[PDB]
């Protein structure tokens, strides 16, 4: 810091430099480009994949009047350009871009955008040392959120990304069933597939999360974003949860529960999101209430026989413990809704499609570790079973899955048997449930016989 | 009505046929925990121990610890041979524990409780007494070795505060009862067990606690407890001096204080038993 | 830390001290350096642990005149202590 | 001033005293009764002393001359050897010894004048309780305390120097930095890689230490150092200020170090939080301040109700200031929850100042794959082709199934099947010139500018796109079933060879009409089948 | 209930054999797998997640504990009439709404939920269920969680009414008196008071320490508004159900004469004027009126006939009825026909009784129910 | 004001009336085109009474132009949307919505 940066080219090579800066603008703000040694200063639309010397510089659009004529002219952005000592090439904006070479107003170039992002940039073939330098309110007042703030504050995010020509990207898993009949050249395709995709808004470009595993810094950041989203919905904070339903979607969580190419920490992330944004407040409301053990004297509760004419998976249920209602998310106008009956089936299907192949002793291993393979799933199934969701015939599927009478017999990572111990704890809690309830039922019947006795006295 | 009698039935039944004693299980369970790099019971004692080592300041009730410390506590010329046979069985049931470091979980857990007197400390002391009971020597050796190894210093602070609490026969409260010994008794039975078997080094350890930063005579504490219990007995006698005939509630709650004073004079007797 | 003015302005004695953790003959030292209250003897080297910070006294490398400055390095390792 | 005091004060470092006998030698000789000695406060370093100016006072060592400061103990209140070079006989226990305290000159006994702030005073008789019994400090607390003495004096001379060059632009430096480093090491937390018992012991000692510096106000002192050091973003000479970055950064590291353990230490930032957030965006030490703010929130449930909208606005603005850092986010997670209990206002405010903007953290949604297949032909007179649609099912899965159809040059346009630009898709590149799908109209630069047409109908399993292109002349226009869709594209690159594209998604069946036309106006003009001429047979790829 | 327990004493009416069959069925393949597999996990590795251990041995606990788990289970369990179950569904759900709030705009939700609990039919009918929910402990815990505003008062209303519903349930509130008095820096004191009222048992069971805290709060009144409150709580303490319990009263007097903390002239000035002061001396003399070897405290009260003139000044002060009522209650319990003639002032108030065609309408009632005392030129 | 724009034609006859339970799919994005909503992402139809004013006023007026089976974009004015408020945690203050509504059927 008057806010600028020194440079040089200390090498036998001086091929090509694309100094496309990482801070895009949307719709006064000076952007000087000092140069001690011609230079192609310009704002650039984020989409720019052209590594070549061949300027200049790679777009008019017109609209007709059901006859042609005017009411047509638009933009030509791709985007901006320029051309024995110091030089000064400012790029002021806001709307309409204006150029001022050497401090003199020689603009009248390209400058027409409706409301689209622009990286400040400078394309340069080096003349060795001290090649370039940077900077009416300051640009810094504009780019960052706290606008206006006129005085210039240099930012750590003010990075200087060179447009590297060949950065590696994901090979994609299964994709489109291509076909094309020669009968008139009728190209055809059927079954769809979806990317687990995301963009980076601060410098817009798409990429799937499946690619994102190699970018471990970025899965770090993103899994922690998921930690934030899980955090915010802590205990019945549904007011925000309806917003996070907007931020992460339902089906997206389903696909997060599907694909095994998803990296571990993200996987546990989304599986914890399913137990946060949605199925978390309710189970928390059915913890203590499950432990209350209060019971009605209705005929279905009147059986109960304790021993069947035993099994944890018995369907007697009974008790009270109030139902966990859900008001479905919508944005048109405090408990987010889910396709529960489908989700339980997906949960058990994730159980089998993990216990099976894991019992086959594979080393993919789904999440990049067995912990990720089981913990999120055993957790989801745990809470989902705690919620009283699952018909008991599916619970029988869980017990044939575990006892069998598969999974629990297997060697396990600690966290997995932790979560397993929690789920099994729910089973024993169901055992205590059935026992206390049967006792209450016999209490009912024996009170009947004994009150019948009481009037004999 | 219908439900009323059902509630009164379950409530009465809870205090009736629920006891009975499935309790016989406790040995078997613990026997299952000693069957082959640490054994499961050792996992248990190391877990509760580390649980006590944590700076919780005020300990949570920890129903788990209650349960298992109660469990282990319940784990413990022909008549002569059978008598020392039972002595060997007992010493074996103690070996099942202290060799697995239980003496240490006891002693750390007591030190942790400080002056608090929850169900916690009581269960720990009963565990201590079950690990000892017989005047067991090795346990006292591990114990004293532990306290001279890790100079936790707060153990004595804790027991001091316990006896600064404790319980007395009291006077006015009885008048309120006319219109808590077992913990004190277990405490002095504990200290008495720590001294029984005539461990000179350990008794002298009680006298001053050598290396620790705050020396704390605990026999003087035991004595002070005996003194305020004493004043409480005297007070109780003067209260009954004129009535001649004694109320049965005044008998049970005086046999109480006599039981305490018996265990506490005895705790002094094992404090001074050796020469 | 001057001490001749013992009257009006007493010395900061809290850190004048140097506990003697160990003392050895010169050759004797070289074994342990390459690898109880015994009385000191002249010709023996001695360690000089500080009573406070407990950093061992040693000759240093840094200069303040070719003479090396004196300091308190953290550990006993090395001939300097 | 001097005070007797009970309750929570025994653990304080200020409640310590150092007995310092007059002899330069044998200071560690056993404490015989009646030997003259100078008592000294451990933290301030000042000796306790009688003085005519204000009676009994703690005072600087230069002021405390022998007889005015010296004290001698007695077994009682009676006023009855020389100085042996030996250790002397054993005497005073810390436990079993009620030692009375006496002045050596005036002979006044140490009693007290008469909320628990019972000031002590000298008096020739006094109350029957003057016999304070001595109690040994742990060596660790003593070390900590003298460490407080040196630390306090060092930061004090430092701060006085900062004031010395503060407001009048044109002194220890390295001593200070080394101080802060050795302090950071003195409060380095025990490693996670260690067995539980010793770890908890070392951690408890860390609590006592972080507490002891806090009780001497050392935290407030370092906070004043940091306060006075934030003035400059750079006075001092080009040397003393050259190391300023290290100084200020180590300050926040040390400052973070004190709070990482105790709850109270971050509870005393209850009023400082606005300052921590104000300095949060210094963009100089940065991470140090961020770690401070993080360490505070994780263990101060009390210091979560305090936070306002401004602070979170400056934290998320901070995330804006420093690119991406999960550290910023964990802070925000610490903002969300105390020890366990939720803070709804705060959660709502993180939500409102962060999430709805959608222009900061990474944002995600499932996307159906984009795909397109060229019919082999390379195309440089004017050229023309049709594209009949036979199957669509627009709203299967989620996304509407794009059927964009148009032109693209070979020297650019690389439809890698996701990702790429703005949620992938056709028309993302300027090289592309597609049409159809949403509102018909164009897609260049991934922009949906709505050119009007007589109908505006979307492609349906009956529609036939009528594309056009011209050599030399850059005019481009497409039609729906022969109906004009106005002048659209104009003035573009003429390099490489453009080819028809026809993008699609999910289940789609569309027929190329190249030659085999179902429909073919003489506008343009040249059928595409003619451009299949070179040698390679026509074959979609 | 006890007779039903005698019916349960069948272990040492042929139905008892069916009961025996019950218990034999209550004696009891999930057990063998859980226990032994937990033993596998323990043997096989030396686990070193402490949470995992806590859970493993929690289950390993409860599997072997097949009789005591039901024992700890039953008190939470409770049977309910099928007809009224729906209200419970409107209850627990709302109760859940406080549970969530136990772990924190929200105050409106709390007051609404607690009010809905107030309106439930399943509340008066099943007090045992209500205590079994632990919900009172929950409410008080939330109240403490707030303390360190209006919704607190709502919690106080709930706790008070919850004390009112029954006495055995009142014991549960009784358990927390010292704690709530630690919480009472300033209505919580109404809650403790309601916790003390009806039960003489509870009235005697209370430790003197609580009263020490209360009189300490009196000692904090060195300048007051809170004094009438504390004295009211002391009144519900000692006076219980008309009878003056010796045990509470004696201690309360011995405490009050230590930190009290010409005063009749201040009373007369209060009459000439600030109502909280006159209410303080009223509630104090009233508290002294609620109490009576034991004889000496009577004399201690005799030190404070200093009265009479307060009753006359009050009769000339027409506010009045409660102050003079306290002076009369004290005058009666502490303190003959000739002196009663000396007191007669009251006939004047009887003349003023016809002015009801107000506050005097209250006074005529208060003094017609205090007209009984004179019954005892 | 509101600026509804038709995307694809429906039956073109059966316009919505007061009190009808309209059945639709739609998807919502901001002016920047950043998505915030999608009924298809829930894979469930969205019913709503029309004229009930259970919805934003622009939704209430804009659907009326639509016919059954019709697809239509909705460039709802903020004042008819959330305006100065903004729906918390999703829609920023003063932000025009962009919908891709599909009116499945009137009921």
Swiss-Prot record, chain D:
All copies of the B30.2/SPRY domain together span: 311-515
Question: PTM per UniProt?
Answer: The N-terminus is blocked. Channel activity is modulated by phosphorylation.
Region of interest called Interaction with FKBP1A, as start-end residue ranges on this chain: 391-402
Q: Where in the cell is it found?
A: Sarcoplasmic reticulum membrane
Into which family does the record put it? Belongs to the ryanodine receptor (TC 1.A.3.1) family. RYR1 subfamily.
What more does the record tell us? Answer: Binding of [3H]ryanodine indicates that the heterozygous channel is activated by Ca(2+) concentrations 4-fold lower than normal. Single-cell analysis of cotransfected cells shows a significantly increased resting cytoplasmic Ca(2+) level and a significantly reduced luminal Ca(2+) level.
Question: What interactions and quaternary structure are annotated?
Answer: Homotetramer. Can also form heterotetramers with RYR2. Identified in a complex composed of RYR1, PDE4D, PKA, FKBP1A and protein phosphatase 1 (PP1). Repeated very high-level exercise decreases interaction with PDE4D and protein phosphatase 1 (PP1). Interacts with CALM; CALM with bound calcium inhibits the RYR1 channel activity. Interacts with S100A1. Interacts with FKBP1A; this stabilizes the closed conformation of the channel. Interacts with CACNA1S; interaction with CACNA1S is important for activation of the RYR1 channel. Interacts with CACNB1.
Q: What is known of its domains?
A: The calcium release channel activity resides in the C-terminal region while the remaining part of the protein constitutes the 'foot' structure spanning the junctional gap between the sarcoplasmic reticulum (SR) and the T-tubule. Pore opening is mediated via the cytoplasmic calcium-binding domains that mediate a small rotation of the channel-forming transmembrane regions that then leads to channel opening.
What is this protein called in UniProt? Ryanodine receptor 1
What is the organism of origin for this protein? Oryctolagus cuniculus
Q: Which gene encodes it?
A: RYR1
Q: Which residues of the full protein are shown?
A: 244 to 824 of 5037
Swiss-Prot record, chain F:
Q: Which InterPro entries match?
A: FKBP-type_PPIase, PPIase_dom_sf, PPIase_FKBP_dom
Per its record, what are the GO molecular function terms? peptidyl-prolyl cis-trans isomerase activity
GO aspect biological process, one term: regulation of release of sequestered calcium ion into cytosol by sarcoplasmic reticulum
Catalysis: reaction(s): [protein]-peptidylproline (omega=180) = [protein]-peptidylproline (omega=0)
Gene Ontology terms, cellular component aspect? cytoplasmic side of membrane; cytosol; intracellular membrane-bounded organelle; ryanodine receptor complex; sarcoplasmic reticulum; terminal cisterna
The source's superkingdom equals Eukaryota
Sum up the protein's function in the record's words. Answer: Keeps in an inactive conformation TGFBR1, the TGF-beta type I serine/threonine kinase receptor, preventing TGF-beta receptor activation in absence of ligand. Recruits SMAD7 to ACVR1B which prevents the association of SMAD2 and SMAD3 with the activin receptor complex, thereby blocking the activin signal. May modulate the RYR1 calcium channel activity. PPIases accelerate the folding of proteins. It catalyzes the cis-trans isomerization of proline imidic peptide bonds in oligopeptides.
Question: Entry's PANTHER family?
Answer: PEPTIDYL-PROLYL CIS-TRANS ISOMERASE (PTHR10516), PEPTIDYL-PROLYL CIS-TRANS ISOMERASE FKBP1A-RELATED (PTHR10516:SF301)
User: What is the name listed in the Swiss-Prot or TrEMBL entry for this protein?
Assistant: Peptidyl-prolyl cis-trans isomerase FKBP1A
Organism encoding this protein: Oryctolagus cuniculus (Rabbit)
Q: Which gene encodes it?
A: FKBP1A
